[PDB]
Design a protein around this ligand. Structure first.
Ligand code: PRO
Ligand code: PRO
Lengths: 405, 405, 405, 405
């Protein structure tokens, strides 16, 4: 950011240049190949650089989905015999990736209670290659002490990876709080409209591969690449290795059309996030005062166990996804869904449309109470993802539905 | 809007249904035909209904461009021998349409000073079929008294057409202040990112064709449509006639791809417009106080000749396009452009990126001072279209550029 | 075409160049504007040039639809008080355009029996600005003597316009047989898959505007174009005027997305048309010999009134759209449709999927018998559009359906 | 294929249904989620079913790229400690995948000479989970005895996987000749125009998982899917497991937009492949008679050792990619490229445009001659990918270039 632009200017402009035609919008390079006079796609290139700029990182790379970005970030530093230490409050898709697919390939993940950063240090051994957390947990809506976990990682010479999907770089930039790599499911807030899948890896460029000694593939001349040393790429070491290795081999590439649509959502990102957050604050204030609401999980509430972490790390708010339970338990939460007119029942989050789900009667309908709890779910649990509709319309819809339960 | 929803809910939801797949986003029906078991495209149909709902109209129809939407609106009610009374401050593209293309076809337009609504009535005769104005003039940034012009039209049994491109329905809804038809170049604020062309016509549904008697094509059964009387369609009479006649015959149809991108922009429309407006207020306040600014045309300024109209009709602000002139006149305006690094030099408006133009040295570089004046431009005139970048960055760009002129 | 490339090379390469990125595919320039340093979109520009090259023309211009292309081609040379002489066997949409929309605007069209070229001559007067035909008429599937009609137009110093939608430039190039302008509904064969609307105008560059004297708007310097004389643009005179005038004013622009899809179809154009034709020859042969078929209109049949025109102008065949009647009349035609499993019932032509329609029981169902024959339709008439499925499969579908009729 | 359609009918129709709107083309479901009343995309679903039908398989699944399709097919049946026996004449990208990314994850691949099928049996042990070949090798253009290799695989209770990218289902259907799984880079011929990446996996439904014993993950109830036994899904077992496991976890999903473009290329697939082949036959015949051509690898040549495999398995030809060497060696090859006007210099294959590359002076320019020989490349080797331009134009281009060499 040589120009010292603010967030809103970067989300509209960063990474974008004007080609020979003068086209003011980024052209969609729906091409597979380039005539020899490029390894990367000129549309996706803008996404790489823009998301990196917004996270105050040094370089980025974009993939088909959040899952593919997380997969590539782990495979970039971990192989058979290596280990990861991860928060045990992970999104279900990431937990399945860690506990099934990657485990089958010789990578062991230890899951720890992230409420105490020392739980990470306990699980580190000579095989650990990264610590892994999410900025805002799902479905616990729990926060973590980025700086304390990053210090533990760095004292042991290993990198700290944060999935910032729920936060977006507008609410928190984990690279400035101890993380070395940030990943996103751009499918959520970055795209903004429930249309387009994508994933992004951003590196921060402040991790000394050579001082660490635990990443020899970064410090050793790779004859596959004419003796290139990835650590000599500085702030592009991690993402160039992804590009040159895991992405080259396994091909979870994003379509240029999808990149185009992510660029459009990036140009309005903070405007939408601000309204997501203000809508959520109003909705949470209404629900917390409602006599039929038994509990709410939103870390910005003064009595939340995560309130101090919210004050420290989330000065613009803690996003627009939260959970709650009604005094009528599982039956009331089921009945609430049925009477809502504006909230859509589905399993996704971070649409411009408000969404709601009662996992115990839908996505987790096969599980008993103990199995539900193992997945961080209770029979009364309801998750809400607040959209950018008019907040008074959303509150009236919740108000009338609560009157039915 | 039976449930009585606010603007922001409508921009996210209006016109959109969930089909048999449950898909939460509107599919892109890139199809030319439909198996006989519909007449309209299901993607574009959402645009039709959403923009109509936002203008508090009864029905809408979408076309390839604002130019096409304006052309179809006029041809819907005017043929050889008919007349139109329009403001003489019209956008140049619309002026060329009226004074060249439609004049060749036997439609005569009278251009009157819109500052006094009585000038419209002076030009009305027995062949007049509509009055036509823009919500906010280009490049005069001039306002007009909607309700006074509408009463003149309706006292003479003719409809009032308003191009609301520069306002959007978030800043003014002309159908609530005497207009019968609103047209948009959706290319501008509705799309929001300078990627996608489209035009929209919305009707208000409160014009009595039969009582007027001046539109026999709306009141007479047509054997082409098997005895249909367009006036019997009530709030869909005007747009159905466009669909059934001018659009069917002349084919300025929008791509379903473009409609999909317009829907995306609609879902963030008020969020963007609000930021356009707050950015513009800040920039205008900074320019009003700058020693090298000689004048500024922005109707919200208390000393503007249009300030009363702004307070009457524009309670949320008067948009993000304005003009100014510098103390160094033509040469200073010519020099300012070369020194700006964030604003983009081009002839468009209403992008997410901030734009500027000094017409006398670019688009109008070939005209002498008299020819310039005939086009609404002076040698010193600069036009700015404010984007949604951070306002401090934009003000800093202007400040460092003004320092060099 | 300086290096004298053949049709198949041009459909893959013509108009396409490699930009600074080396992208081998044409990027999609989904942009509304260009930094001032442009009305021509770089994606659509390739369509312009490629279709013009395939028709052996000098310049092209692309619009939203075939209807828009036809409208602009007529408005480009005809205004109020002017006249057109057209075949009375026109596509229905074109008939409606000429007889309703353009008539309302002072352009009079006389419809003459095109079977006799002198019928065009006898309708010419001092107001006539063009002769207009289609290469293959619909629903009659009738051919016309291009060179005879073209000589007539030129002896009177007016242009000859041919709608070559049904032919494509692969089967006939009317600009080589007396036409001055060719228009296409690119929606049909050029796109090839029933997904994408567009229209194209191609000029031949062999008409002497000055020697004619009947087109002063082409030869007088125009002050709103800095004294430009359109005739001085040579083989780009007609399409530049459309671009600078009718298209500029009325805005029937094509989306860059649609242009990109038309380029894809063009790259397979002759391969698909060849198979359309061979499939149709096989199917017509089967139906002509079938005891339940009463008559078939396909001009390549030796007993057709049009066979001589087919041999002269259509050495590669006469397309894939034909009509037929069954011995069981209307009832048998409608039962045929009911029993078919592979043909799709709809009103379109030139999909990759085979299509069929019985107009008297659908698109013309509320019309008596004098009604229909005025529209070239009889109660028994069936129209088939042959796709590129396997010919044996289509014949087996026809055979099993006919067995039940 | 319940009604026994031929290839050309399937490539137009298979997998496609008409929804409630009647839309004749497949809508683009650019959506991330679906309201609960899955997440299989309805656009991509048509690709899955169409490619499976064309390969005469029972089920398919589509991924972001061919690389991702191959990755998922291997991970579907191999984990840490497992082994693959592949031909040593692999596409370079696939060699890198097996030899780098997968080897790091505990999957060992043995590479054997595929000219002798016994070489596959030699390398089989109790860790082997599949045999892997390409239908037409690169860059040797070598063929393999599908039935012989398939018998070895099944004698050992393991599956046989064939990458049919170079063949397409039009030229050979390995599932009918002993293969159990066919993968495609749909980026190449299926897309057809160098615009759109994709990969597809098709299973044949004939492999008895329970009888084999070597795939316990297919026969054991999976608690992650409520006791599902994947083998119980019959001819959907392999691809459902990919969908539910590897693709779920690692997320190399295809964009609905890319699926839409693949559908369009499928509707013309056999038409393009036929022209690719006939062009290549003409070009190879010309090159083989040319005095400056020292050697040509094309399996259909009468002196090719692969001629009998071409006759047995490729009745419609052996594709449009081949290699040759010139009498002037490396310097002559380099010069040929510089003088060609129609062939595009780049590293890809199977565009509609003809493509050419001389690896020794471009992609592998940094390798010495014995590094070259490791990759099956000689200093004189040229690879040509023949497009669908006019064959005489292409022959003329080759002739004038050779004359300067
Ligand atoms: O403003 C927005 O958020 C949308 C995103 C896609 C195009 N415009
Ligand atoms: O026919 C074809 O090959 C192309 C593929 C994309 C659209 N049409």
């Amino acid at each position: 950011n040589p120009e010292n632009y603010h967030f809103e200017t970067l989300q509209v402009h960063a990474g974008q240049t004007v080609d020979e035609t003068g086209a003011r919008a980024v052209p969609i390079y729906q091409t597979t190949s380039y005539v020899f006079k490029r390894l990367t796609n000129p549309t996706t290139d803008v996404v790489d650089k823009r998301v990196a700029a917004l996270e105050h990182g040094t370089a980025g790379v974009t993939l088909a989905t959040g899952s593919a970005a997380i997969t590539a970030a782990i495979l970039n530093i971990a192989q058979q015999g290596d280990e990861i230490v991860a928060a045990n409050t992970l999104y279900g898709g990431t937990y399945d990736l860690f506990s099934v697919t990657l485990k089958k390939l010789g990578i062991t993940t230890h899951f720890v209670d992230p409420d105490e950063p020392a739980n990470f240090e306990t699980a580190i051994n000579d095989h650990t290659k990264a610590l892994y957390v999410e900025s805002i947990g799902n479905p616990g809506i729990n926060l973590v002490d980025f700086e304390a976990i990053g210090k533990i990682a760095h004292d042991h010479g290993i990198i700290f990876i944060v999935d910032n999907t729920f936060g977006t770089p507008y609410l928190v930039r984990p690279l400035e709080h101890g993380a070395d790599v940030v990943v996103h499911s751009a499918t959520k807030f970055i795209g903004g409209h429930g249309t387009t899948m994508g994933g992004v890896i951003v590196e921060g460029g402040q991790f000394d591969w050579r001082a660490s000694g635990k990443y020899p593939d970064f410090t050793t001349p790779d004859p596959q690449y004419n003796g290139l040393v990835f650590a000599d790429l500085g702030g592009a070491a991690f993402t160039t290795k992804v590009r040159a290795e895991t992405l080259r081999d396994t091909g979870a590439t994003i379509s240029p059309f999808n990149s185009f649509l992510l660029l459009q959502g990036l140009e309005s990102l903070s405007l939408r996030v601000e309204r997501h957050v203000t809508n959520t604050r109003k909705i949470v204030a209404f629900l917390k005062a409602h006599p039929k609401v038994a509990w709410i999980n939103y870390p910005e509430l003064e009595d939340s166990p995560y309130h101090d972490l919210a004050t420290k790390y989330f000065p613009n708010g803690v996003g627009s996804i939260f959970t709650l339970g009604l005094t009528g338990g599982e039956a009331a939460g089921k009945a609430l869904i049925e009477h809502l007119q504006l909230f859509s029942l589905l399993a996704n989050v971070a649409d411009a449309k408000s969404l709601i789900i009662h996992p115990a009667s839908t996505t987790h309908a096969q599980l008993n109470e103990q199995e539900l709890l193992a997945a961080g779910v209770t029979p009364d649990l309801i998750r809400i993802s607040v959209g950018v509709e008019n907040a008074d319309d959303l509150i009236a819809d919740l108000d009338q539905a609560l009157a039915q339960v």
